[PDB]
Amino acid sequence: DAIEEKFRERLKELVVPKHVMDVVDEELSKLGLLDNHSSEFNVTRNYLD
């Protein structure tokens, strides 16, 4: 979440469309659950980036 801060803080200014905001919301919920070493975790991290 610290790494995503660099995204969030930007989002405070440039409005996030309610669609996009909900999508990043569920991805933000999923992202913490994910194991640190699964290749899917690095993939979803790069995707969320």
Partner 1 sequence: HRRTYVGAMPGKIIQCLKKTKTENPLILIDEVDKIGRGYQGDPSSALL
Rg (the chain; Cα; Å): 11
* C-beta separation of 27 from 48 below 8 A: yes
Task: Look up residue 22 and give its amino acid.
Answer: D
42 binds partner 1 (CB under 8 A): yes
39 binds partner 1 (CB under 8 A): yes
In the complex, the smallest distance separating the C-beta of residue 14 from partner 1, rounded to whole angstroms, is 27
d(CA 34, CA 36): 6
Stretch that binds partner 1, among 3-11, 12-20, 28-36, 38-46 (CB under 8 A): 38-46
Residues of this chain that bind partner 1 (CB under 8 A):
39, 42-43, 46
